[PDB]
Design an enzyme around this catalytic site. Structure first.
Site, PDB file in Angstrom:
ATOM      1  N   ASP A 538       0.959  -1.314   0.133  1.00 55.18           N
ATOM      2  CA  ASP A 538      -0.040  -0.091  -0.061  1.00 55.18           C
ATOM      3  C   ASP A 538       0.863   1.316  -0.127  1.00 55.18           C
ATOM      4  O   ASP A 538       0.542   2.135  -0.815  1.00 55.18           O
ATOM      5  CB  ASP A 538      -1.025  -0.043   1.054  1.00 55.18           C
ATOM      6  CG  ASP A 538      -2.153  -1.224   1.058  1.00 55.18           C
ATOM      7  OD1 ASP A 538      -1.792  -2.144   0.372  1.00 55.18           O
ATOM      8  OD2 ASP A 538      -3.105  -1.107   1.737  1.00 55.18           O
ATOM      9  N   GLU A 735      -1.486 -10.046  11.206  1.00 49.49           N
ATOM     10  CA  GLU A 735      -1.429  -9.342   9.881  1.00 49.49           C
ATOM     11  C   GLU A 735       0.415  -9.118   9.713  1.00 49.49           C
ATOM     12  O   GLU A 735       0.632  -8.924   8.423  1.00 49.49           O
ATOM     13  CB  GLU A 735      -1.996  -8.014   9.631  1.00 49.49           C
ATOM     14  CG  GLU A 735      -2.314  -7.534   8.467  1.00 49.49           C
ATOM     15  CD  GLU A 735      -3.019  -6.412   8.195  1.00 49.49           C
ATOM     16  OE1 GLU A 735      -3.781  -5.830   9.430  1.00 49.49           O
ATOM     17  OE2 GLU A 735      -3.145  -6.016   7.054  1.00 49.49           O
TER      18      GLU A 735
HETATM   19  N1  WQZ Z   1      -3.542   0.608  10.362  1.00 46.40           N
HETATM   20  C1  WQZ Z   1      -3.468   0.249   8.918  1.00 46.40           C
HETATM   21  C2  WQZ Z   1      -4.830  -0.501   8.216  1.00 46.40           C
HETATM   22  C3  WQZ Z   1      -4.871  -0.258   7.038  1.00 46.40           C
HETATM   23  C4  WQZ Z   1      -5.868  -0.352   6.195  1.00 46.40           C
HETATM   24  N2  WQZ Z   1      -5.927  -0.619   4.634  1.00 46.40           N
HETATM   25  C5  WQZ Z   1      -7.228  -1.033   3.728  1.00 46.40           C
HETATM   26  C6  WQZ Z   1      -7.355  -2.126   3.636  1.00 46.40           C
HETATM   27  C7  WQZ Z   1      -8.486  -2.445   2.750  1.00 46.40           C
HETATM   28  C8  WQZ Z   1      -8.735  -3.977   2.777  1.00 46.40           C
HETATM   29  C9  WQZ Z   1      -7.836  -4.907   3.293  1.00 46.40           C
HETATM   30  C10 WQZ Z   1      -6.799  -4.741   3.874  1.00 46.40           C
HETATM   31  C11 WQZ Z   1      -5.749  -5.852   4.114  1.00 46.40           C
HETATM   32  N3  WQZ Z   1      -4.844  -6.112   3.475  1.00 46.40           N
HETATM   33  C12 WQZ Z   1      -3.909  -5.089   3.107  1.00 46.40           C
HETATM   34  C13 WQZ Z   1      -2.878  -5.570   2.354  1.00 46.40           C
HETATM   35  O1  WQZ Z   1      -1.795  -4.469   2.273  1.00 46.40           O
HETATM   36  C14 WQZ Z   1      -3.139  -5.732   0.926  1.00 46.40           C
HETATM   37  O2  WQZ Z   1      -1.633  -6.146   0.309  1.00 46.40           O
HETATM   38  C15 WQZ Z   1      -3.875  -7.144   1.267  1.00 46.40           C
HETATM   39  O3  WQZ Z   1      -4.270  -7.615  -0.067  1.00 46.40           O
HETATM   40  C16 WQZ Z   1      -5.119  -6.715   2.062  1.00 46.40           C
HETATM   41  C17 WQZ Z   1      -6.088  -7.930   2.345  1.00 46.40           C
HETATM   42  O4  WQZ Z   1      -5.378  -9.027   3.054  1.00 46.40           O
HETATM   43  C18 WQZ Z   1      -6.226  -3.430   4.018  1.00 46.40           C
HETATM   44  C19 WQZ Z   1      -7.114  -1.020   6.852  1.00 46.40           C
HETATM   45  C20 WQZ Z   1      -7.140  -1.152   8.196  1.00 46.40           C
HETATM   46  C21 WQZ Z   1      -8.620  -1.548   9.058  1.00 46.40           C
HETATM   47  C22 WQZ Z   1      -9.663  -1.871   7.854  1.00 46.40           C
HETATM   48  O5  WQZ Z   1     -10.860  -2.608   8.474  1.00 46.40           O
HETATM   49  C23 WQZ Z   1     -10.732  -3.084   9.924  1.00 46.40           C
HETATM   50  C24 WQZ Z   1      -9.723  -2.299  10.822  1.00 46.40           C
HETATM   51  O6  WQZ Z   1      -8.519  -2.194  10.069  1.00 46.40           O
HETATM   52  C25 WQZ Z   1      -6.024  -0.672   8.783  1.00 46.40           C
END
Ligand code: WQZ
Length: 765
Positions: A538, A735
């Protein structure tokens, strides 16, 4: 024979607890059909049950942990839930009983044990919710003998085209059912199992919590109307017991109240199969499934030193079981912007502002419906298909059950549109959408994601060249079957390859750029000032500002991964003209990775921009990106560049922490800056790729054999012990891991590519 194996796999995998978004529920691999879900909560007051009731997966201070102790989607398994708020340790055992023409039968046992802190007389409400979608299908609760509810079992008789005739039984169960001495017991009974049979329009049947609560609220309204008040109120657990009204409907609520420990069974009996399913059948098939899970684990995940110990075996079984136990079936419409606005071509400087303007047109619309059968990163946070995550998920699953992994690959490639696009994030139906802010739902047909599913296909091809047990490997044991799978998929792989090259192309020719090939150059679309979400990394630092002349070394390496796979699969199908083309493309990426991306000054691979003065500038941020041609298996074992990358990997002052490789170097200016997602922490998926490539070099004649052996040994040990120590202390897979403290951070229940640790332990790549 291919056609015959397909039917047996369809019948085998039809039923599952394929609702990983909720603690416990079942559905078959059919969009509009029969679905079940469990709810429970303590009731101590007139207003608490709305706050205590459980249904959809969460993780907070009120929940110690939960997950599958064992699981195989062809047989079922056992899940443990440790709920502090409701003072209960729950077990949910699910088992599948083959037979008939409609995908077999199944059974579940729900067991609730109060923990040591719970009051011994706690009242606990338990609900089994059943819904059925479809125009020409029927479901009916057989009414009880008694006036006010059921003394014994609840029998639902139903039918559909898809499932034929069936009965679903919720047994009486064991446990104290409390009794009210209040006046109200004259009209509602003193306390018993009750059923409400209802109908709503098919598209809202999934909203089980609001549906339940609308019935509870109607019952409290009835109390107020009929003069039951605070001068002399019924006990809370009786205020929240639904009036019995069984019947026909597309929704059936089965409610029980228990005092202290409880258990009860769910028995789904397919009429087209043998005799009906019994509680004695459930107990036997549960014991048999554990045995078979045990035997298979020992063959497939044989943990090597120093992780042979029983402590590491329990850890392994838990990581693996939670990964394969996240498998869901999702069905519904997707939200896609199909405008193909020209701003999305990102051809000018400042392209991110133009693309924002296009998004603020809001031309996205619902399309489909689509289905997907896939594993997921996280039940509580990310319970849906992510495209590059699924490449990592399937590496251990393919070891377990190669035919299962090919089914999930086939499911993913059946989403690909005419152009060769699969959305990187599959949010299928209103239930899946309910978990996702409206702002993050829309998919964009110009957004790629790493093609990590090709890694699984590579493992299948190597295995190909060299009854549940029989089905799990039918596609490798029967070469004719293997090839036909590949023959049918091959065109869609080619289409996706061609889609990357049309949509994710970089600009060599319009700039002062010299290189072997005029063709081979890649840039990820979708990038903003601070982010490149489509790469998977990201906030890994990229050229500032973003620029249409950018070239991304990770993307070129992923294109290399695809050609290498197309060469293997093309060769196998005798697609001669294709293999000559792929061979020439591969040769060109090998040269162009050096000419466009190699930095001699810095001793690693780098992304590239165009200067203020319109010349090619390398931009080097030492980290995962810097290693990418090594991680994706593109470098010869004798390469001097490889040797310099082994120096970077091993260097404590850059990437090498005691807990694994850092995403970014401590030396980089952007270490530990901004949201710090991919700018320092240790990520098990990229560590897994490094571990496998080190091992490849370690088991081969060449100059770096012994350097690789030492780095392999230590990195495997560091990664496994970090995930293990955190699991032992917290009960969770995380994670990512903190390279200073070794602590797991961000999201829990990340199984999720963190479960790669089972393959790392088992070794022998
Ligand atoms: N603090 C930091 C942080 C960053 C994000 N970013 C957005 C995001 C959206 C969809 C999935 C993901 C997960 N990963 C990110 C990986 O980088 C990617 O490579 C991979 O495919 C996907 C799928 O595993 C992250 C979200 C949250 C948070 C969201 O909702 C519940 C509470 O925490 C916390």
């Amino acid at each position: 024979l291919h056609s015959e194996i397909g039917r047996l796999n369809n019948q085998s995998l039809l039923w599952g607890p394929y609702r990983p978004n909720i603690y416990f529920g079942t559905r078959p691999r059919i969009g509009k059909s029969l679905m079940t879900g469990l709810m429970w909560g303590k009731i101590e007051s007139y207003t608490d049950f709305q706050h205590t009731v459980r249904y959809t997966c969460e993780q907070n201070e009120g929940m110690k942990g939960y997950g599958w102790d064992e699981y195989d989607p062809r047989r079922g398994g056992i899940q443990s839930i440790h709920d502090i708020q409701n003072g209960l340790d729950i077990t949910t055992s699910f088992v599948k009983i083959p037979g008939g023409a409609h995908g077999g039968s199944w059974a579940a046992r729900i067991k609730g044990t109060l923990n040591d802190d719970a009051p011994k007389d706690q009242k606990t409400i338990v609900v089994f919710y059943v819904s059925q979608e479809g125009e020409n299908s029927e479901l009916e609760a057989v009414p009880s003998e008694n006036e006010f509810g059921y003394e014994g079992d609840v029998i639902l008789k139903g039918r559909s085209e898809a499932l034929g005739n069936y009965k679903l039984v919720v047994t009486k169960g064991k446990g104290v059912i409390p009794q009210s001495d209040h006046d109200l017991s004259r009209l509602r009974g003193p306390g018993q199992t009750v059923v409400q049979s209802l109908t709503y329009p098919d598209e809202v049947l999934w909203q089980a919590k609001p549906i339940l609560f609308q019935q509870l609220k109607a019952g409290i309204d009835w109390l107020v109307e009929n003069k039951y008040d605070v001068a002399d109120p019924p006990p809370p657990w009786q205020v929240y017991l639904l009036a019995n009204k069984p019947g026909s409907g597309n929704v059936h609520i089965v409610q029980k109240v228990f005092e202290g420990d409880f258990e009860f069974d769910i028995l789904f009996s397919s009429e087209s199969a043998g005799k009906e399913v019994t509680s004695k059948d459930l107990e036997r098939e549960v014991k048999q499934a554990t045995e078979v899970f045990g035997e298979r684990f020992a063959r497939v995940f044989d943990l090597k030193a120093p992780f042979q110990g029983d402590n590491y075996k329990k850890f392994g079984k838990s990581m693996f079981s939670n990964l394969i136990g996240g498998i869901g079936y999702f069905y519904g419409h997707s939200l896609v912007d199909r405008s193909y606005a020209p701003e999305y071509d990102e051809e000018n400087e400042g392209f991110w502002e133009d693309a924002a303007e296009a998004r603020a047109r809001h031309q996205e619309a619902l399309e489909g419906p689509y289905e997907l059968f896939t594993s997921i990163p996280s039940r509580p946070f990310f319970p849906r298909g992510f495209l590059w995550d699924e490449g990592f998920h399937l590496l251990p699953i393919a070891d377990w059950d190669i035919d299962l992994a090919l089914e999930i690959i086939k499911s993913w490639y059946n989403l690909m549109d005419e152009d060769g696009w699969i959305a990187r994030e599959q949010i299928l139906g209103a239930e899946a959408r309910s978990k996702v802010p409206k702002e993050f739902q829309t998919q964009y047909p110009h957004y790629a994601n790493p093609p990590t599913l090709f890694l699984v296909l590579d493992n299948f091809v190597e295995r190909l060249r060299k009854l549940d047990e029989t089905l799990s490997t039918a596609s490798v044991d029967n070469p004719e079957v293997g090839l036909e799978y590949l023959r049918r998929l091959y065109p869609l792989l080619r289409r996706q390859f061609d889609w990357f090259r049309k949509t994710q192309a970089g600009d060599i020719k319009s700039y002062d750029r010299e290189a072997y090939s005029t063709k081979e150059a890649y840039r990820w679309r979708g990038r903003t000032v601070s982010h490149c979400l489509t790469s998977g990394l990201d906030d890994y630092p990229r050229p500032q500002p973003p620029h249409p002349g950018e070239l991304h070394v990770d993307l070129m390496s992923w294109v290399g991964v695809m050609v290498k796979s197309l060469i293997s699969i093309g060769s196998l199908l005798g697609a001669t003209e294709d293999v000559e083309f792929y061979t020439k493309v591969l040769d060109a990426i090998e040269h162009n990775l050096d000419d466009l991306h190699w930095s001699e000054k810095e001793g690693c691979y780098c992304d590239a921009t165009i200067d203020e003065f319109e010349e090619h500038k390398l931009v080097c941020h030492k980290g995962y990106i810097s290693l990418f041609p090594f991680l994706t298996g593109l470098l010869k074992p004798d390469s001097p560049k490889l040797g310099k990358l082994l120096a970077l990997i091993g260097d404590e002052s850059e990437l090498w922490s005691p807990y694994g490789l850092r995403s970014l170097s401590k030396k980089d200016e952007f270490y530990g800056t901004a949201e710090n997602y991919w700018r320092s922490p240790v990520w098990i998926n990229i560590n897994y790729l490094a571990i496998v490539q080190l091992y490849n070099i370690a088991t081969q004649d060449g100059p770096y054999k012994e350097t690789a052996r030492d780095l392999y040994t230590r990195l495997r040990k560091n990664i496994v012990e970090t995930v293990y120590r955190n699991w032992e202390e917290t009960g969770f897979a995380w994670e990512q891991y903190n390279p200073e403290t070794g602590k797991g951070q961000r999201t829990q229940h990340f199984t999720g590519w963190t479960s790669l640790v089972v393959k790392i332990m088992s070794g022998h790549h």
